[PDB]
Design a protein around this nucleic acid. Structure first.
Ligand SMILES: [K+]
Ligand SMILES: [K+]
Ligand SMILES: [K+]
Ligand SMILES: [K+]
Ligand SMILES: [K+]
Ligand SMILES: [K+]
Ligand SMILES: [K+]
Ligand SMILES: [Mg+2]
Ligand SMILES: [Mg+2]
Ligand SMILES: [Mg+2]
Ligand SMILES: [Mg+2]
Ligand SMILES: [Mg+2]
Ligand SMILES: [Mg+2]
Ligand SMILES: [Mg+2]
Ligand SMILES: [Mg+2]
Ligand SMILES: [Mg+2]
Ligand SMILES: [Mg+2]
Ligand SMILES: [Mg+2]
Ligand SMILES: [Mg+2]
Ligand SMILES: [Mg+2]
Ligand SMILES: [Mg+2]
Ligand SMILES: [Mg+2]
Ligand SMILES: [Mg+2]
Ligand SMILES: [Mg+2]
Ligand SMILES: [Mg+2]
Ligand SMILES: [Mg+2]
Ligand SMILES: [Mg+2]
Ligand SMILES: [Mg+2]
Ligand SMILES: [Mg+2]
Ligand SMILES: [Mg+2]
Ligand SMILES: [Mg+2]
Lengths: 127, 54, 124, 201, 90, 193
RNA sequence: GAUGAGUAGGAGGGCGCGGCGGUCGCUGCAAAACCUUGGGCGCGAGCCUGGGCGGAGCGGCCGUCGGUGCAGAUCUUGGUG
RNA sequence: AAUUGUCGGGAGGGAAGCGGAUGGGGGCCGGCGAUGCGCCCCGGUCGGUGUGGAACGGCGAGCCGGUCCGCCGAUCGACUCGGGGCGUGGACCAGCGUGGAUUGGGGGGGCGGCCAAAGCCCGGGCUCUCGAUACGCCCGUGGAACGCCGUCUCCCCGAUUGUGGAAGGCAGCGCGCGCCUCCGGCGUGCUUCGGCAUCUGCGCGCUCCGGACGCUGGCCUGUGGGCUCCCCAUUCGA
């Protein structure tokens, strides 16, 4: 399958937004939280501090949610759901759900080859 | 005055405006030459720094 | 920097769509979105806006008041973005063509008995 | 028919004569008489089934009206000019410029006998044109073109003979100028205190 | 009763792009041609060393008037009103 | 026709000045009818009166520029925002460059680039202005329809001056950059357009 | 076409947890949980997936509901420097 | 999970961590990167106008259809069928060319303004000296070059960048549609006598013209390429 997308993917930022002071404290997890403190230097955006996520970082709508291979992911749990991508094989690629058995993955992979549907994790748990 | 000016203009088919206008820029003109009086700064005198002098 | 208020953006709120989930109302909105755009008619634009409005902004119209405003205008079609109710204080009901979102059971019976017609906005 | 352009250009896109002047020169007045006092009116100049239908409509790029123009030749470079190669395996060697090919590249020769540089194509951006000129009037390279340097290792004997034929006519001209043979046999290099932006070539 | 069924142009600098300027001001071409032709004549005239628009009497009057005006421009005050500083002012 | 008129006015002024010189008198040039105003200070710490006047002049951003007709009403407004602006008398060259390079028309309260004469005609057509040359002529001569023609022009978004400013905090007379600089506004228009 | 600061505060659109009414699925050919210098998506809350461990359950979607989201409270209980 | 031992990698001149930017060393990734397509004949395989049936349909009794089976005629076509020949070529990176937009820098030319520059040079008249061999004043429609300011215009170099994917539109021209000796010449109207959108329509083309195209090379299981992952170093911030 030849991906239909042609515009290059431009990531405004590739680093993640780490919660402030999650390095200092084990109990403070890395998932982002907006600092609400009155004196918070991060909230006040002093230079040399952690950056906060804002809408300006939004990616181009034409390349948003596109994988590096040039397709968009759709999660499939069986062979029937795979057939939904027959007419979108140049736009959407399939990914087999993490909990599908190896026996049922062989059926999905074989069916995807007939439909020319890209499978992102076709080598999963077959050894 | 505005009513009559518009009436006098309506009969002759000439659309005009009766609005007042603020003072605009003056046009160019020639001024006849005359004797020129030269103005220069005055030398300072401390005695004159008082109404009527010291 | 730019010396504007709220970055030059509007701070006014108006209804751009009905708040209701009524499937029939949404079909009427689609019908009159098309009519307003493709005709430029002021009547269609007004009708479209009133279909968005809340219940209190679509008050009912009594049949008696409908008759008084329709006196001497039999040929014209009465249009109401709202409900038409029956009025026991009105005795003589002339034949009239009325378009409304809803007719009460008594109001519909009296209008139909008098030879009139109750229309919907798709028939209008 | 007309032998020369009616309206020479003062600058690119502006003719020397106005519309009123051009009407006289175009002769439309004469044409009007021959056609009953009217300018003649002309008329405008008057499959296999697919084997596969794509699911997504194909998009064709919009029209671009800009057309590439031939590569320009630097004013410093004239036939017979000595060039200094600035890059590649022959960096620093002094060669003789013969002509510019249709691709815009420069055709140069060592000559091969003096410095071992054969008939080769060198990009203009990687050479410096000096002020030394060697006569190449007797050199004939009309047979050489872009296709002569196209791939399809032993060098065929045909090209070796072709090098010598072009080379032979050029050696006599080079030998005429004293110390020119040694000049073309030595590579150019920068020594201490040598500033390229001040060097005269 | 329905009415019949119904992208930004990249702005280019007309001060540099000739065709863009002619689209806005067609007379600009005539102005361009005349300026180029006028300059060419002057350049040619200077090389050939090619050789008045005022009467001889008029020229004399103009020189006299300008010379008289210049005299008033450089004229100085007599500094007579400063009686207390006559010596200092010279 | 406009090109011929501009040349005649320039030569007409020269002739009159020479005529007055010959007779020994003076020729007072006509007072400037058109001004070009540029905002040189930012939007921080604005006193309320200055803030309102700059809004009425459509100077809401530093280095924005607009034309302004000369009359006692407008001149007195300008006098009250002297330290925040610099202005002067624009010549024909300045008006051409501004309108041609940075000219945008206000159509239905939208900023539209003057790429074609159709844009000018869409708004000013009823006033007889159908091309950018007509628009230039109306501005330079301050014609009868100056108000509509000038308001049709979106305030010019000029760049920071090439070469910088001297001192925005002082008046041009003191060696600064604020206030009336008369014909020297053109020198600044070159470096900011 | 214009435009983008925000404490107290307001509102919108979304993310996540556990049930219920439905609907579409997964699982001893290995579910949940947990581990990982595997990889990717989203501005972000989060999401998807490889490998490992584990050995019996689980998830998506629509609606609807709630004892539904923690770094602090000399917070509680337990554990540990 | 806190916390601890051990093995392995790494760092450490009175904290460490953290933001941003690269680099070194690791680790990881083949949807990390293609190998097809078009046209030929050799063979193989599989189906083909007009009449018969079977089960149905679109439009609204009647017209208008396809699918499947069979029979004739017609004799071609198809083929993720196998070989051969010819043409063509994918991902990423780099270079170059020609241009658009934005922008910085450099060089030249024309014209105008001034005391219709001043001055200087030439010619003429006056004045006649202490810094001693002057100081300067006035004249000429004399001459050769500058100066400042304004304006018109030509050329050269570098930098960043290609968003859009429906339109050969808009604008300005060229060549034909009439002849000549062809850098140009030949007809009306207007003209400042230089010129002029006054005649300047059609057809086919060109261009600074409704947003970048073209060419070439490198590399493609490698010591390659990529990386948002890991450790560390360095400059800035903190
Ligand atoms: K369920
Ligand atoms: K994981
Ligand atoms: K739920
Ligand atoms: K100049
Ligand atoms: K470029
Ligand atoms: K490669
Ligand atoms: K650092
Ligand atoms: Mg990210
Ligand atoms: Mg505070
Ligand atoms: Mg798993
Ligand atoms: Mg802003
Ligand atoms: Mg605000
Ligand atoms: Mg301040
Ligand atoms: Mg702006
Ligand atoms: Mg600079
Ligand atoms: Mg400064
Ligand atoms: Mg201050
Ligand atoms: Mg905000
Ligand atoms: Mg759940
Ligand atoms: Mg870890
Ligand atoms: Mg979920
Ligand atoms: Mg509960
Ligand atoms: Mg709770
Ligand atoms: Mg806690
Ligand atoms: Mg808290
Ligand atoms: Mg505690
Ligand atoms: Mg405790
Ligand atoms: Mg303890
Ligand atoms: Mg642990
Ligand atoms: Mg001059
Ligand atoms: Mg593009």
């Amino acid at each position: 399958a030849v991906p239909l997308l042609n515009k290059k993917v431009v990531k405004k930022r590739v680093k993640r937004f780490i919660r402030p002071q999650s390095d200092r404290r084990i109990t403070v997890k890395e998932s982002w939280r907006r600092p609400k403190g009155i004196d918070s230097r991060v909230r006040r955006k002093f230079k040399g501090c952690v950056l906060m996520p804002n809408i300006g970082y939004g990616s181009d709508k034409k390349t948003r949610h596109y994988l590096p291979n040039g397709f968009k992911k759709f999660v499939v749990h069986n062979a029937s759901e795979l057939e939904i991508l027959m007419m979108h094989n140049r736009t959407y690629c399939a990914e087999i759900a993490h909990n599908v058995s190896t026996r049922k993955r062989k059926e999905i992979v074989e069916r995807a080859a007939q439909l020319d549907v890209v499978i992102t994790n076709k080598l999963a748990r077959l050894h | 005055k505005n009513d009559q000016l518009k009436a006098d203009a309506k009969a002759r088919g000439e659309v005009i405006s009766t609005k007042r206008q603020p003072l605009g820029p003056k046009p160019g003109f020639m001024v006849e030459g005359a004797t020129l009086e030269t103005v220069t700064p005055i030398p300072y005198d401390v005695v004159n720094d008082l109404k009527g002098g010291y | 920097g730019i010396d504007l208020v709220a970055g030059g953006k509007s701070k006014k709120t108006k209804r751009t769509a009905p708040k209701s989930d009524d499937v029939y109302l949404k079909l009427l909105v689609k019908l009159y979105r098309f009519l307003a755009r493709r005709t430029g008619s002021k009547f269609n634009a007004v009708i479209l806006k009133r279909l968005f409005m809340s219940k209190i902004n679509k008050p009912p119209l009594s049949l008696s008041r409908l008759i008084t405003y329709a006196t001497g205008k039999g040929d014209n079609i009465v249009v109401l973005v709202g409900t038409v109710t029956d009025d026991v204080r009105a005795y003589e009901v002339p034949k009239i063509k009325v378009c409304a979102l809803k007719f009460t059971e008594t109001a519909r019976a009296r209008i139909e008995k008098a030879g009139g017609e109750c229309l919907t906005f798709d028939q209008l | 028919a007309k032998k020369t352009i009616r309206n020479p250009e003062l600058i690119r896109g502006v003719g020397k004569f106005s519309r009123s002047k051009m009407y006289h020169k175009k002769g439309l007045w004469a044409i009007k008489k021959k056609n009953g006092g009217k300018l003649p009116l002309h008329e405008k100049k008057p499959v296999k089934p697919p084997k596969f239908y794509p699911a997504d409509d194909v998009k064709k790029p919009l029209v671009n009206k800009h057309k590439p123009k031939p590569t320009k030749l630097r004013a410093s470079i004239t036939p017979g000019t000595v060039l200094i190669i600035l890059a590649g395996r022959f960096k620093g060697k002094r060669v003789v410029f013969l002509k510019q090919l249709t691709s815009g590249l420069l055709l140069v020769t060592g000559p091969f006998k003096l410095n071992g540089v054969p008939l080769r194509r060198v990009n203009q951006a990687y050479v410096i044109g000096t002020s030394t000129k060697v006569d190449v009037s007797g050199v004939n390279v009309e047979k050489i073109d872009d296709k002569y340097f196209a791939k399809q290792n032993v060098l065929p004997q045909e090209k070796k003979d072709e090098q010598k034929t072009v080379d032979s006519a050029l050696l006599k001209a080079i030998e005429g100028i004293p110390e020119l043979k040694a000049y073309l046999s030595a590579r150019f290099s920068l020594k201490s205190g040598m500033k390229p932006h001040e060097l005269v070539f | 009763v329905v009415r019949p069924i119904k992208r930004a142009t990249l702005k280019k600098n007309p001060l540099k792009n000739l065709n863009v300027l002619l689209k806005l001001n067609p007379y600009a071409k005539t102005a361009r041609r005349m300026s180029l032709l006028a300059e060419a004549q002057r350049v040619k005239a200077k090389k050939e060393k090619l050789d008045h628009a005022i009467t001889k009497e008029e020229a004399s009057a103009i020189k006299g008037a300008s010379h008289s005006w210049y005299k008033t421009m450089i004229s100085d005050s007599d500094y007579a009103e400063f009686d207390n500083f006559t010596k200092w002012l010279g | 026709q406009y090109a011929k008129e501009y040349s005649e006015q320039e030569k007409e002024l020269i002739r009159l000045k020479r005529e007055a010189r010959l007779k020994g008198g003076f020729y007072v040039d006509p007072e400037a009818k058109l001004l070009f105003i540029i905002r040189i200070r930012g939007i921080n710490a604005m006193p309320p009166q200055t803030k309102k006047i700059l809004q009425l002049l459509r100077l809401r951003q530093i280095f924005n520029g607009v034309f302004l007709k000369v009359n006692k009403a407008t001149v007195n407004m300008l006098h009250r925002v002297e330290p925040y602006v610099t202005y002067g008398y624009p010549n024909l060259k300045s008006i051409k460059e501004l309108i041609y390079k940075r000219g945008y028309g206000k159509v239905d309260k939208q900023r539209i680039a003057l790429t074609d004469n159709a844009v000018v005609e869409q708004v000013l057509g009823k006033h007889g202005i159908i091309c950018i040359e007509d628009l230039v002529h109306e501005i330079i001569t301050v014609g009868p329809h100056f108000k509509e023609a000038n308001n049709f022009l979106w305030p010019f978004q000029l760049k920071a001056p090439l070469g910088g400013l001297k001192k925005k905090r002082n008046h041009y007379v003191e060696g600064g950059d604020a206030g009336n600089r008369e014909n020297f506004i053109n020198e600044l228009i070159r470096r900011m357009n």
